[PDB]
Amino acid sequence: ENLYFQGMPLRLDIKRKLTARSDRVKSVDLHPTEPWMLASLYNGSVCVWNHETQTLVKTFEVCDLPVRAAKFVARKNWVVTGADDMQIRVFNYNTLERVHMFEAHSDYIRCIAVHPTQPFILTSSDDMLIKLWDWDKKWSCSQVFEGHTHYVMQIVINPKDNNQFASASLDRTIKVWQLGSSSPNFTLEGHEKGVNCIDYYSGGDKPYLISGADDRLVKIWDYQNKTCVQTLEGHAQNVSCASFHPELPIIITGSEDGTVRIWHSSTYRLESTLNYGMERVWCVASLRGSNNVALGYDEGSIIVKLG
């Protein structure tokens, strides 16, 4: 695990684009065409920062309980939110209006994933369920995904097969699903404690996803062979978030240890451990065609340009 065994450090140019001090940030999202970062806060605020002006340009009155999930739906001019009061709230970011809301779940909403081509959102909950909603059909529930036996912390749609998606649960399992069926395709076991995050590698050359757990571990999974291909140790606490960068050959992980770790996406060399002094890390967002990465902490959110 040193220069006699591991390759040369990656060149990783790092510039701070935004530092937005706030109450605890539970989710971030980057807008595909506006220079915008979304953040959802413990205090029930959802904020849109312009990372070119470095100004707060929009906020939404969502509720005064935590909002753990917020995403843009760029093609609908929406921010979709999920709150601890079990409501999905859809806002128009042009008019700032709440255009729709409904009761989605019977406990905290942890996560939202927005279908890229179909009028669907997936929601995941402490009620142990994942639900499919069709905004072309009056936000009616298309599907209830049953099988997790604890909180479903995070869900992500396979960007190479939009009929497939994966879930991370405090039941220590990852499940892989297809939209047509209420029962999982399969379960991936290996984490020793609750799984907090799940992401797909976007490249066609590996059928990989990445997870982080309360066991302090990051794991790389082959979703075809249904095996753990790699365990990455070094985090000193719960791993809250994990992503493959879409434009750089890196993996980015964040932890309640207050660090973001950057690893080489093929060799798994530790490139970087960065504690930006905002206490616990909760969430990371990246954007196809961008070097910008959003990070949410106890003490606010930042955007770093990587490479």
Ligand X SMILES: *C(=O)[C@H]1[C@H]2CC[C@H](C2)[C@H]1C(=O)O
Nearer to ligand X, 43 or 143 (CB): 43
What number of chain residues touch ligand X (CB under 6 A)?
3
Give kind and range of the element (H or E) at residue 249: none
Q: Toward ligand X, which CB reaches closer, 42 or 276? A: 42
Give the C-alpha separation, 263 to 260, whole Å: 10
Strand partners, 293: 286, 304
Closer residue to ligand X (CB): 35 or 44 = 44
Among 10, 17, 24, 148, binds ligand X (CB under 6 A): 24
CB contact at 8 A, 121 and 111:
no
Chain positions 189 to 218 lying near ligand X, rule: CB under 6 A, are none
Indicate the residue among 215 and 271 with the shorter CB distance to ligand X.
Answer: 215
Contact track, ligand X, 27-56, x by CB under 6 A: ---------------x--------------
Find where tokens 């997870």 sit: 211
Q: Which helix (H) or strand (E) is 18 found in, with range?
A: strand 14-21
Least spacing, CB of residue 281 vs ligand X, in Å:
11
Distance CA 52, CA 131 (A): 36
Strand partners, 243: 252
CB 249 within 8 A of CB 266: yes
Q: Is residue 99 a contact partner of residue 84, using CB atoms and an 8 Å limit?
A: no
Q: Least Å distance between CB 122 and ligand X?
A: 19
C-beta closer to ligand X: residue 247 or 279: 279
Q: Does 23 bind ligand X (CB under 6 A)?
A: no
Q: Which residues bind ligand X (CB under 6 A)?
A: 24, 26, 42
